[PDB]
Design a protein around this ligand. Structure first.
Ligand SMILES: Cc1cc2nc3c(=O)[nH]c(=O)nc-3n(C[C@H](O)[C@H](O)[C@H](O)COP(=O)(O)OP(=O)(O)OC[C@H]3O[C@@H](n4cnc5c(N)ncnc54)[C@H](O)[C@@H]3O)c2cc1C
Length: 296
């Protein structure tokens, strides 16, 4: 009754009142020095106790207390590993975490509570985990699906999870034969996430995986406009539009809230040519599980 992989789905095994206590096994900065901020890839032990799947999130409760002396409110992070984890044994989970640092209106530097806690983790440290959480970003059941994945920044996370399942693992009950197409938008080359893994998947499975980067501070269209994800999609617009008409095409979008706006402009321009109102047609595709969005 869903087109997505929800059979036996588990949500909310661990709740904030009694989280699962994992251990940090690894934590590595995956961005270079020429990135506006730092993004970190981290691995936690789970003892096989968190039965998550591709597209789900976990909550993290940062150590310490809020200003009223209460445990910190959980923050959600899209799981960056496949169900088996990076080590193929269902005993780890990985996150892709941007360290939040900003300057407020008074001019003071503010550090995000949970993202700085996570990026500062050392191997051996305890981590309080909740979940798994979510059903919107579950993968399509159809092993022959066209899966279009639209990511900005840490929005790559659930797509790393999908792609590990599709291309880096053997699953008797899921032999991917379709077309996975990832668009990843970041500002600089040093901000690219998982470039090596992705480019290996593309060398590995060229018939089944397409990869486009949109490096906005480095690439421009014919008019000289910055190469965001939508700018890159424009170069394949008619093909993307024809793909969307098909019953086995599924679009997923993940990352920074607001990334959906420029994408909508591309889709509006495609749809209007055919006398279709994209703002109305998008609602239909969402209901049909073919337009699946998780932005934050
Ligand atoms: C479903 C889901 C999936 C997510 N997946 C990921 C992921 O894969 N990777 C990842 O890094 N994050 C992810 N996030 C975001 C994550 O949950 C946190 O919101 C993020 O890490 C920042 O939390 P923090 O505790 O560090 O910052 P906080 O200490 O919570 O500070 C952020 C808060 O500060 C306030 N604020 C005021 N001005 C600003 C400003 N200028 N900029 C920012 N905040 C401001 C706002 O109230 C804001 O909510 C996801 C969120 C959701 C909901």
């Amino acid at each position: 009754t869903s087109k997505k992989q929800d059979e036996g789905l588990v949500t909310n095994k661990y709740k904030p009142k009694e989280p699962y206590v994992g251990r940090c096994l690894s934590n590595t900065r995956i961005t270079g020095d020429d990135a506006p901020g730092e993004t970190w890839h981290m691995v936690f032990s789970t003892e096989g106790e968190i039965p998550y799947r591709e597209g789900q999130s976990i909550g993290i409760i940062a150590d310490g207390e809020d200003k009223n002396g209460k445990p910190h409110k959980l923050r959600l992070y899209s799981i960056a590993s496949s169900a088996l984890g990076d080590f193929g044994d269902s005993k780890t989970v990985s996150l892709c975490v941007k360290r939040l640092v900003y300057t407020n209106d008074q001019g003071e530097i503010v550090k995000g509570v949970c993202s700085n806690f996570l990026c500062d983790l050392k191997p051996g440290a305890d981590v309080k985990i909740t979940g798994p959480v979510g059903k919107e970003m579950l993968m399509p059941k159809d092993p022959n699906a066209t899966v279009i994945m639209l990511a900005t920044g840490t929005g790559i996370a659930p797509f790393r999870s999908f792609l590990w399942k599709m291309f880096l693992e053997e699953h008797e009950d899921y032999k991917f034969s379709g077309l996975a197409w990832l668009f990843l938008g970041v500002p600089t080359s040093d901000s690219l996430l998982y470039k090596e893994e992705l480019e290996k998947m593309k060398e590995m499975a060229p018939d089944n995986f397409r990869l486009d980067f949109a490096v906005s501070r480095e690439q421009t269209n014919a008019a000289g406009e910055k190469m965001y994800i939508q700018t890159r999609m424009a170069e394949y617009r008619e093909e993307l539009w024809e793909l969307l008409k098909k019953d086995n095409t599924y679009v997923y979008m993940c990352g920074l809230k607001g990334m959906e706006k420029g994408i909508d402009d591309i889709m509006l321009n495609l749809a209007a040519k055919d006398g279709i109102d994209w703002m109305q047609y998008k609602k239909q595709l969402k209901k049909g599980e073919q337009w699946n969005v998780e932005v934050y």
